Curated annotation (Swiss-Prot), chain B:
Outcome of substituting D395N: Misfolding, absence of secretion
PANTHER family: ACETYLCHOLINESTERASE
Chemical reaction(s) catalysed: acetylcholine + H2O = choline + acetate + H(+)
Subcellular location, record wording: Synapse; Secreted; Cell membrane
UniProt-annotated binding residues for huprine W: G119, S200, W430, H438
Name of the gene encoding the protein in the UniProt record: ACHE
CDD domains: Esterase_lipase
Keyword Amino-acid biosynthesis: no
Keyword Chloroplast on entry: no
Source species of the chain: Homo sapiens (Human)
Protein name: Acetylcholinesterase
Outcome of substituting E325A: Loss of activity
Function of the protein: Hydrolyzes rapidly the acetylcholine neurotransmitter released into the synaptic cleft allowing to terminate the signal transduction at the neuromuscular junction. Role in neuronal apoptosis.
Family, per entry: Belongs to the type-B carboxylesterase/lipase family.
Length: 531, 527
């Protein structure tokens, strides 16, 4: 009649899950659990309302809809881009979460990993195949949770000060999911006193913002930030710029026929979701890569100050964090607008294309700041060698957007009481479809963290499956103990700046997360932008 | 009497002296007056040609050194005393010296003209390290050296005034160059093959003659050693020159530019010298009070502006630096440094040294320097900070001005040869942490190691003979070769290392560091 392992009661009511086959054994999965009221119609742009209790049994047996988002069409049918595209229908009815737990249910409380996907705050879904939590749960006997959150205008369009579109509601969907975990994860065997957030890119920036927001900080105990930080130049926006982009989006879709914020949002709520998605990229002030229209707003509520300020002034005793980057963070973003770049050739750019790419990769800085960038990333013994120029532009975008914000986040946390571990992911997957010059691109450590190479229908090498199991062990040991060890992985500190390389070879300790370059981005360039 | 030692120039008759070298004799004519003594009412005025004389001027010994500060940092120490005046000081100092082979050449012989350095505040043609006897015997050239007014006597300027016009020390040099054109053939020299060479402020002087049309017709080739006219220390603007001259007057009790200069001319020369260093606007190393002024006359624009707009086709220049240009200047004001300790400074002292080594720049510019010269994996290492500050000072003041001058000239038609002098003399008295300090290639260029009464090794004498051949090859043909030394170009940026080993070709005169000083920092300062 019924399998008791697949029946769980939470606060809202009863749920029914599925038994998942994994290479290593069965796993219980509860996919598509509603945690908020559907943010439809009058509740578009509003903070999430908690899901009201239900009678009967909710079938949590498949992934729910993807939150409405732009769908990438740059390389149609290409695996390297389609793997990030929605694998479910688009809907504003999208605030559901997923729980994976061992089969049978754990008898004693079990550490919990909570995943927050990335995608520039304009895309992403917990349902993508590369976020499949079944392998982590089977291999390491943790409970894994992932949630959807609203993206694009639906999650982050802000008319600051207004009550109809206050902004950051996509972050509040994440927080509501975290509150759901605290109240309900024990029913699945999870330990609410041992919750570790991990996320990638905008997911990592989200994790950092929960660290810096007191109402979120009490909902978890450790953090993992992969290829992202809340202090990234793309991750937040000012109140004035948020209002200008919101107002321009309205104007582009016929609203109003600025003004009263209530009349404005009300007009926006009458437009079909796809109409807003279609005009989203037009509100960006300039021709850029690695910039996104609707992102978290620094408005005094969710973030009482900028992530930079909160980081430098924070007390982080009692916190363990694991951070890292891939070896070639910038290359992926260059084929999305940088002159002379394509995945289908070598992208051997000229000096003129390099200088033009600097303004696209570092938008909105004075000519002087752009000149400092070029001075720094030019080899003045080979100022016009195309291969060096291509690699230098990739470093510019990667350093400025990922590596140096990550490094600043690691150094300040370590100096102010936190226990920090840092990595650089240096393995290029045998299955990677991107060209060779891109190296190890952004986002391609995730599949190894989630143990995807263990999927039988894949054709990863046996070496890569060992590698994946090593990384899952590191991540789960961190979740359990705040220490990935059990060759050792030394903590990161502001002085020694030690990190480990993650590849098929054993751990190798190195110093400096591009210390020379990040001194420019983190120490000097802010002083230049102040005068 | 020996006929070889009697020469008639346009002003009258001279009697020289025969000197010994290990390779044979040489004729020397020392202390030839080329200008009327710039005394009394003539102080601060451009030089006037020496009036003809009757009888025979005695040209057998060096004449007086122009009035200058005497360094007292390490009294009795050979490293500093070798640069101090070795004759009595006098304002009557406008004399020059000629060395020629013995017997005097009967065919026109290429001419080398030496302009000494000393920050435009010191120096003398009579110093032992500038002895021309070895070059003349070994390489069969005529060598000329002149004294020129330094300090306030040479470069005090009230711009626009006819009583203190400025740059008269440079005009002293030009007058000697005109004297060379009119009289050097009487010594066997060829006035159509004149090569200027100088070091530090002498090299800056050479560059300024390259950039001044009235001087350009008086020589044909140029050598600039560890100096350039575009250095941040080599010129001053009119406003700052007037302020420094006015501050000097107040410091000596004076007093209308006419009234100001008249009172200044009442003061003993040593009184002006005693207050010279105190007109500088800030504490600093590698800055000097009275330097050439850019007032539209001798220089119609800044040396950088003239270098960028110049057609230099038909010019050959030889330029270079020593391996550690900055180390010597640090013991004259940088906190934590001394020749008697390892000078292992702290980070705080490094940051303090940056403000004195790069004076008169905004805090933002100083931060840019600190960013570029910090190893952010070893930000506090004492030995690394000592080198970094030595690099800051050497790059800012010598290497990058030299590299900018080389690249611009080469890109605009002239043939450049560049070197880095990398041999530390066995006789060097400075501590080992200073490496190859500023100025210690000169003794090898002049062949001083060939002096038997000195302690140079057999290899160092061969090395000195190599360098004399390169320098003389350049003076004869505009090409030091005869392991080839390739020309310096803005793209390939090739230079050679000069030491006991054979020539080695390398690329880039600290290209990464000099891109910052040369390309970025000017834009920063303009904002
Ligand atoms: C390398 O490719 C880029 C991008 O090209 C597109 O992709 C190529 C693989 C090829 O299919 C092209 O025909 C495509 O247009 C080239 O940059 C483009 O160049 C074209 C023609 O000059 C121009 O119209 C586009 O605007 C350019 N796009 C971008 C993003 O720069 C580049 O010229 C190629 N370089 C080579 C051939 O080495
Ligand atoms: C190295 O020496 C300098 C200068 O000190 C002078 O020279 C020494 C060789 C010795 O003769 C001292 O008596 C001299 O005072 C040191 O810098 C000075 O340090 C003193 C304090 O000891 C301080 O009062 C001065 O202001 C400093 N002056 C400068 C130029 O910085 C330096 O600390 C010594 N470093 C070592 C010991 O390695
Ligand atoms: C603040 C303001 O004046 N703007 C008005 C508001 O007063 C009114 O309640 C609302 C009704 O939709 O329309 C808008």
């Amino acid at each position: 009649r019924e399998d008791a392992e697949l029946l769980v009661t939470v606060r809202g009511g009863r749920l029914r899950g599925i038994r998942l086959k994994t290479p290593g054994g069965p796993v219980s999965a509860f996919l598509g659990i509603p945690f908020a009221e559907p943010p439809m119609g009058p509740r578009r742009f509003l903070p999430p309302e908690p899901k009201q209790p239900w009678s009967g049994v909710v079938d949590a047996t498949t992934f729910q809809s993807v939150c409405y988002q732009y769908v990438d069409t740059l390389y149609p049918g290409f695996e390297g881009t389609e793997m990030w595209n929605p694998n479910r229908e688009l809907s504003e009815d999208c605030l559901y979460l997923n729980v994976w737990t061992p089969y049978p249910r754990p008898t004693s409380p079990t550490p919990v990993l909570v995943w927050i996907y990335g995608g520039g705050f304009y895309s992403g879904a917990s349902s993508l195949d590369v976020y499949d939590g079944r392998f982590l749960v089977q291999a390491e006997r943790t409970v894994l949770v992932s949630m959807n959150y609203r993206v694009g205008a639906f999650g982050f369009l802000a008319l600051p000060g207004s009550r109809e579109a206050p902004g950051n509601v996509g972050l509040l969907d994440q927080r509501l999911a975290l509150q759901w975990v605290q109240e309900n994860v024990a029913a699945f065997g999870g330990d609410p006193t041992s919750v570790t957030l991990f996320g990638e890119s905008a997911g990592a920036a989200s994790v950092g913002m929960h660290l810096l927001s007191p109402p979120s900080r009490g909902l978890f105990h450790r953090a993992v930030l992969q290829s992202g930080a809340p202090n990234g130049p793309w991750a937040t926006v000012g109140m004035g710029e948020a209002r200008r982009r919101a107002t321009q989006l309205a104007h582009l879709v016929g609203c109003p026929p600025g003004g009263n914020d209530t009349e404005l949002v009300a007009c926006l709520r009458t437009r079909p979701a796809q109409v807003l998605v279609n005009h989203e990229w037009h509100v960006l002030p300039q021709e850029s890569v690695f910039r996104f229209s609707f992102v978290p707003v620094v408005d005094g509520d969710f973030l009482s100050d900028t992530p930079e300020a909160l980081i430098n002034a924070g007390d982080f005793h009692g916190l363990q964090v694991l951070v890292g980057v891939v070896k070639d963070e910038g290359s992926y973003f260059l084929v999305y607008g940088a002159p002379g770049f394509s995945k289908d050739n070598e992208s051997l750019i000229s000096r003129a294309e390099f200088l033009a790419g600097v303004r696209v990769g570092v938008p909105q800085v004075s000519d002087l700041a752009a000149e400092a960038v070029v001075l720094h990333y030019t080899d003045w013994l080979h100022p016009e060698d195309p291969a060096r120029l291509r690699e230098a532009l990739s470093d510019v975008v990667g350093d400025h957007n990922v590596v140096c914000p990550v490094a600043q986040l690691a150094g300040r946390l370590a100096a102010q009481g936190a226990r920090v571990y840092a990595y650089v992911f240096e393995h290029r997957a045998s299955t990677l479809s991107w060209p060779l010059w891109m190296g190890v691109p952004h986002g391609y450590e995730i599949e190894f963290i989630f143990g995807i190479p263990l999927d039988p229908s894949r054709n990863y090498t046996a070496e890569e499956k060992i590698f994946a199991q090593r990384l899952m062990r590191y991540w789960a040991n961190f979740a359990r103990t705040g220490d990935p060890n059990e060759p050792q992985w030394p903590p990161y500190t502001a002085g020694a700046q030690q990190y480990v390389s993650l590849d098929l070879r054993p751990l190798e300790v190195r110093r400096g997360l591009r210390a020379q370059a990040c001194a420019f981005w983190n120490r000097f360039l802010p002083k230049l932008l102040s005068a």
